[PDB]
Paper text:
The membrane-associated sortase recognizes the LPXTG motif of the substrate protein, cleaves between the Thr and Gly, and forms an acyl-enzyme intermediate. According to the current model of sortase-mediated pilus assembly, the pilus polymerization catalyzed by a pilus-specific sortase is followed by cell wall anchoring of pilus polymers by the housekeeping sortase. To understand the molecular basis of pilin sorting and pilus anchoring within a bacterial strain, we investigated the housekeeping sortase, GBSSrtA, and a pilus-specific sortase, GBSSrtC1, from the PI-1 pathogenicity island of [name] SAG 2603 V/R. Either GBSSrtC1 or GBSSrtC2 of this GBS strain is capable of polymerizing GBS80, the pilus shaft of the GBS PI-1 pili.
Residues 44–55 and 44–54 in type II (A and B chains, respectively) and 44–51 and 46–53 in type III (chain A and B, respectively), which cover the putative active site from one-end to the other, form the lid region in GBSSrtC1. Analogous to the Asp58, Pro59 and Trp60 residues of the conserved DP(W/F/Y) motif in SPNSrtC1, Asp49, Pro50 and Tyr51 of GBSSrtC1 anchored the lid in its active site. In addition, the preceding leucine residue (Leu47) was observed inserted into a highly hydrophobic pocket in the active site present below the lid. Cys184 in the GBSSrtC1 monomers displayed a single conformation with its sulfhydryl pointing toward Arg193, which adopted a similar conformation in all of the monomers due to salt-bridge interactions with Asp49 of the lid DP(W/F/Y) motif. Arg193 also formed a weak hydrogen bond with the backbone carbonyl of Asn190, except in the type II chain A structure.
Author numbering: 6 to 39, 44 to 55, 60 to 207
């Protein structure tokens, strides 16, 4: 929410860059494999510390989607704790700080009575934009692909070398959840202007 934007301003640029660098290294690591053992976010299988460097007052950034007027905190891992309050990052996929050979997967709950979250993620079209905001600032994506897969298929979630992507992942059809609707953005130039 607001505790992020503010809490961020209070941190020193050097500290920030130290922390971003640690994330880039993580990402470069993931990019390098071979394929990470990826695991259905929608199950208990046991706090998470992989993304400590990005963590600022519990979150690691914010996901903005103008088309559906959503601005949702992001939390590391996909524990139900976090899916109750916002989007959860899927451990094994790139940290959502961007860079070539990264593919971050962000996942969210549809239909919750508390928050809407990715409830209206079906209204998102190719062409649309969303933004990840993190300790580093705000980066921009343009939806380049929307795809419906079976729950045990994952090829679509891996890093694509030389490419910079973020996928918003939810369940589908609405209220049947036999499948997974993936909305994947592709990094585009964005000059944050006051």
């Amino acid at each position: 929410i607001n505790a992020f934007k503010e809490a961020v301003t209070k941190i020193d640029r050097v500290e920030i860059n130290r922390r971003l660098e640690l994330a880039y290294a993580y990402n470069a690591s993931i990019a390098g494999a071979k394929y990470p053992a990826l695991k259905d976010p929608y199950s208990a299988e046991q706090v998470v510390e992989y993304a400590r460097m990005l963590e600022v007052k519990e979150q690691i950034g914010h996901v903005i989607i103008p088309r559906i007027n959503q601005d949702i905190p992001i939390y590391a891992g996909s524990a139900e704790e976090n899916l109750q309050r916002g989007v959860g990052h899927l451990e094994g996929t790139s940290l959502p700080v961007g860079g070539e050979s990264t593919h971050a997967v962000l996942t969210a709950h549809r239909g919750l009575p508390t928050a809407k979250l990715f409830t209206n993620l079906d209204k998102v079209t190719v062409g649309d934009r969303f933004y990840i905001e993190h300790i580093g600032g705000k980066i921009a994506y343009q939806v380049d692909q929307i795809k419906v897969i079976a729950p045990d298929q994952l090829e679509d979630l891996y890093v694509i070398q030389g490419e910079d992507h973020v996928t918003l992942l939810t369940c589908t059809p609405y209220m049947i959840n036999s499948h997974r609707l993936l909305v994947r953005g592709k990094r585009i130039p964005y000059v944050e202007k006051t």
